[PDB]
Design a binder for this molecule. Structure first.
Ligand SMILES: *[C@@H]1O[C@H](CO)[C@@H](O)[C@H](O)[C@H]1NC(C)=O
Lengths: 49, 49, 35, 37, 49, 49
């Protein structure tokens, strides 16, 4: 969810700090789409460390 | 007052320098006029603006 | 209400900062001269 | 100040050192004073 | 909903004033050097001189 | 409106903790909080949805 919007040029966040930092010159595009039918397993999927 | 012309040149130059230095204390719309304060308070993404 | 003139009274330091041999204006809440 | 007067405030300069910055966190609209009685 | 649930908010108001610094962070104090160019950081006036 | 007297304000554990939905800051940055030396801090608290 919101972590999808947490990645962007010049953004501070837990994703930015340690997981996935985008540079502040990002000449690209971020394509995000809900994936409840692809990788969302019932009871919570423990593959998202 | 005989040497008004010579003194005027000195006064004009000193006055111009003083205004130049006084301009260093202006904000220009920034949060602070001290460059160190901006650097020590904000991350690069928000310090550049 | 009796009245009087305050000649050169109620002058304080608007800023806690020190400085020497400077004639600088300060926009601050002061007591008017001769008020 | 170390004044020595006859009557009324004198003529002359005198600064005012900052004594304390009281953290009140209130508003103020009307004030009074206190005296020795 | 997420937009209508109890959201506790505490807003911390600061001020970058030359007034004496009373609230500061956990940084160890070093020794006083003099007669030498150094990066001096006493309370907030970080700088070189 | 509770303010803070003289102390050593350790802001370090305020964003490095998964207990805050939003940590938006203006005029200051989370990682830079620990290095600041404020004259005072106001802790104003209210609740919104
Ligand atoms: C201060 O707050 C009180 C409480 O309502 C109010 O009556 C008064 O008018 C306020 N004064 C100012 C100057 O806002």
């Amino acid at each position: 969810g919101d972590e999808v919007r947490q990645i962007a040029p010049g953004q501070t966040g837990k994703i930015a700090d340690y997981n996935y930092k985008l540079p502040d010159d990002f000449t690209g595009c971020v394509i995000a789409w809900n994936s409840n039918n692809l990788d969302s397993k019932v009871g919570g999927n423990y593959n998202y460390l | 007052s005989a040497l008004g012309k010579l003194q005027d040149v000195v006064n004009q130059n000193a006055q111009a320098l003083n205004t130049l230095v006084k301009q260093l204390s202006s904000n220009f719309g920034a949060i602070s006029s001290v460059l160190n304060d901006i650097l020590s308070r904000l991350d690069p993404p928000e310090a550049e603006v | 209400p009796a009245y009087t003139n305050s000649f050169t009274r109620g002058v304080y330091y608007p800023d806690k900062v020190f400085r020497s041999s400077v004639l600088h204006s300060t926009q601050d809440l002061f007591l008017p001269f001769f008020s | 100040t170390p004044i020595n007067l006859v009557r009324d405030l004198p003529q002359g300069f005198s600064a005012l050192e900052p004594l304390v910055d009281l953290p009140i966190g209130i508003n103020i609209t009307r004030f009074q004073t206190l005296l020795a009685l | 909903g997420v937009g209508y649930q109890p959201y506790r908010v505490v807003v911390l108001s600061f001020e970058l004033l030359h007034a004496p610094a009373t609230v500061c962070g956990p940084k160890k104090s070093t020794n006083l050097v003099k007669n030498k160019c150094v990066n001096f950081n006493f309370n907030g006036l970080t700088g070189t001189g | 409106r509770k303010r803070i007297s003289n102390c050593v304000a350790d802001y370090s554990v305020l964003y490095n903790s998964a207990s805050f939905s939003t940590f938006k800051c203006y005029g200051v940055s989370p990682t830079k909080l620990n290095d600041l030396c404020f004259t005072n801090v106001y802790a104003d608290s209210f609740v919104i949805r």
